Structure 1
Amino acid sequence: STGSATTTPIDSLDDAYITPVQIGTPAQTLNLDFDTGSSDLWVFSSETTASEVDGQTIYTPSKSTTAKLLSGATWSISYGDGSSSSGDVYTDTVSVGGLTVTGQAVESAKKVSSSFTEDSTIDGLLGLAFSTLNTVSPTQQKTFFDNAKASLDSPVFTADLGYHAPGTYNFGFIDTTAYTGSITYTAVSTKQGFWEWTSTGYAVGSGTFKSTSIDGIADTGTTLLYLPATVVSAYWAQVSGAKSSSSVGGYVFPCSATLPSFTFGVGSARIVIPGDYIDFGPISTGSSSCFGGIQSSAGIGINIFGDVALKAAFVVFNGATTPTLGFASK
């Protein structure tokens, strides 16, 4: 089997991407944030605290003839951005782009943090990291990909995120029309539950490539590119007037700037992030200070190849017995 679904930026900055997902019988379609950095499929629901729902579409399990309470199961998650959610668990039929899993754990939110309530565009998350990170207790549950894997034509999914434009998630096949040149594969460690890999180095604009190992995670559920402070200082030193602002919480730059590109290594291959991808716009409405898309990972404890980096590539999440990542230009 295969599936193919379009993913759409939630706003003009590509702050996140939503993908429609069918849950239940008859189908209830919710727009979920596909997150290769976490392993829970959770949704706004008919059980969510009413004051914490502001415009989201909700899953109502009582209206699904295939929904079953997973007796005694609860879940509770915190994300790197300080956001959180928790609740109870149903199993139900879940379809993405024509690919159907029966008996998927659908984690129904009873509580969500302020950031989730305040974002009307995201109805929940669909985790695509390894199932060892799933938070369901007392019986840990499998991701949508882990449940689908054995049925797929090939045990893979791909992320093709757009810059200010829709993109695609595919399951079970690699669309050879969707990228240029060849796919370079690189080793993955699953020891922390992430798609964790080692970049071979970086360049700033037309500068020389620096060969240096940068361990980090491929994370579709993080907006920005978080890298070591040495690398980030080198990038922003090429932008007149750029500075790290403790009050704003990262590097800012004059909105009148033209930003340089950023290149990262995948083995002997190179992925180029255009400068425009690194502009996240005014820090507040009408400001001439703009927020940078490359930020320090100091204090996060891991480097994160988020959407700023991934949207410059066609990315293969290879779930073979020994997982690997693939990157192509596009």
Structure 2
Amino acid sequence: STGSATTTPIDSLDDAYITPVQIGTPAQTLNLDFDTGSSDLWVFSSETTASEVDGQTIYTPSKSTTAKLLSGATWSISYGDGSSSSGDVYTDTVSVGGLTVTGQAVESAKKVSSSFTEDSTIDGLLGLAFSTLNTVSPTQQKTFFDNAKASLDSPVFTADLGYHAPGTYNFGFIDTTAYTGSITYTAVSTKQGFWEWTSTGYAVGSGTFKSTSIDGIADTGTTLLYLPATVVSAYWAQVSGAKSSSSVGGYVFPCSATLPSFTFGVGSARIVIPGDYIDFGPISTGSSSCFGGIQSSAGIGINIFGDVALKAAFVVFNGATTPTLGFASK
């Protein structure tokens, strides 16, 4: 089998991407944030505290003839941005882009933190990291990808995120029309439950490439590119008037600037992030200070290749017995 679904930015800045997902019988379509940095499929629901729902579409398990309570199971998650959610668990039929999994764990939120409430466009998360990170207790549950894998034509999914435009998540096949040149594959460590890999280095604009190992994660659920402070300082030093602001919480730059590109290494290959991808717009409405898309990881404990980086590539998440990542230009 295969599946193919369009992913759409939630706003003019590409803060996140939503993909429609069919849950239950008859189908209930929710728009989920596909997240290769976490491993829970959780939804706004008929169980969510009413004051914490503000415009999201909810899953109502009592209206699904295939929903079953997973007795005794609970979940609770906290994300790198400090957001959180928790609840109980159903199994139900879940389809993405024509690919169906029966008996998927659908984690129903009883509580969500204010960032989730305040974002009417995201109805929940669909985790695509390794199932070892799944938070369901006392019986850990499998991701949608892990449940689909055996049925797929090839044990892979691909992320093709757009810049200010829709893109695609494919399951079970590699669309050879979706990228230019060849796909460079690189080793993955699953030891922390992430798609963790080592970039071979970077360049700033037309500058010379610096060969240096940068360990980090391929994370579709993170907006920005978080790298070591040395690398980030080298980038922003090329932008007149850029500075790190403790009050704003990162590097800011004059909105009048033209940003340089940023290149990262994948083996001997190179992915170029255009400068425009690094502009996250005014820090507050009408400000002439703009927020940068490349920020320091120093306060995180891991480097994160988030959407700023991944949207410059066609990315293969190879779930073979020994997982690997692939990157192509597009």
Q: TM-score, normalised by structure 2?
A: 1.00
Residues of 1 paired with 2:245 and 2:226: CA distance?
16
- Measured after TM superposition, the shift of residue 10 of structure 1 is 0.0
Residues of 1 paired with 2:50 and 2:259: CA distance?
43
The aligned residue for residue 272 of structure 1 is 272
Matches within 5 A, 1:289-328: 289-328=289-328
What secondary structure, in the 3-state scheme, does the structure 1 residue paired with 2:252 have? strand
Residues of 2 paired with 1:220 and 1:26: CA distance?
29
Residues of 2 paired with 1:233 and 1:101: CA distance?
45
What secondary structure, in the 3-state scheme, does the structure 2 residue paired with 1:45 have? coil
Question: Which string of whole-angstrom CA distances, capped at 9 and with x for unpartnered residues, describes residues 203-230 of structure 1?
Answer: 0000000000000000000000000000
What secondary structure, in the 3-state scheme, does the structure 1 residue paired with 2:177 have? coil
What secondary structure, in the 3-state scheme, does the structure 2 residue paired with 1:5 have? strand
- Measured after TM superposition, the shift of residue 50 of structure 1 is 0.1
- Measured after TM superposition, the shift of residue 195 of structure 1 is 0.0
Residues of 1 paired with 2:274 and 2:45: CA distance?
39
Point out where structure 1 has 5 or more consecutive residues left out of the alignment.
none
Task: Kindly report the root-mean-square deviation, in angstroms, between the aligned alpha carbons of the 2 structures.
Answer: 0.1
What secondary structure, in the 3-state scheme, does the structure 2 residue paired with 1:14 have? coil
Matches within 5 A, 1:166-205: 166-205=166-205
Question: Which string of whole-angstrom CA distances, capped at 9 and with x for unpartnered residues, describes residues 172-203 of structure 1?
Answer: 00000000000000000000000000000000
Residues of 2 paired with 1:91 and 1:285: CA distance?
43
- Measured after TM superposition, the shift of residue 107 of structure 1 is 0.1
What secondary structure, in the 3-state scheme, does the structure 1 residue paired with 2:88 have? strand
What secondary structure, in the 3-state scheme, does the structure 1 residue paired with 2:51 have? helix
Residues of 1 paired with 2:304 and 2:146: CA distance?
23
What secondary structure, in the 3-state scheme, does the structure 1 residue paired with 2:290 have? strand
Residues of 1 paired with 2:15 and 2:88: CA distance?
28
What secondary structure, in the 3-state scheme, does the structure 2 residue paired with 1:265 have? strand
What secondary structure, in the 3-state scheme, does the structure 2 residue paired with 1:71 have? strand
Structure 1 residue runs of 4+, over 2 Å off?
A: none
What secondary structure, in the 3-state scheme, does the structure 2 residue paired with 1:32 have? strand
Residues of 1 paired with 2:152 and 2:316: CA distance?
15
Q: How many aligned positions are there?
A: 330
The aligned residue for residue 226 of structure 1 is 226
- Measured after TM superposition, the shift of residue 95 of structure 1 is 0.0
What secondary structure, in the 3-state scheme, does the structure 2 residue paired with 1:164 have? coil
Residues of 2 paired with 1:228 and 1:54: CA distance?
37
Q: TM-score, normalised by structure 1?
A: 1.00
- Measured after TM superposition, the shift of residue 299 of structure 1 is 1.3
The aligned residue for residue 240 of structure 2 is 240
- Measured after TM superposition, the shift of residue 149 of structure 1 is 0.0
The aligned residue for residue 94 of structure 1 is 94
The aligned residue for residue 209 of structure 1 is 209
Residues of 2 paired with 1:68 and 1:327: CA distance?
39
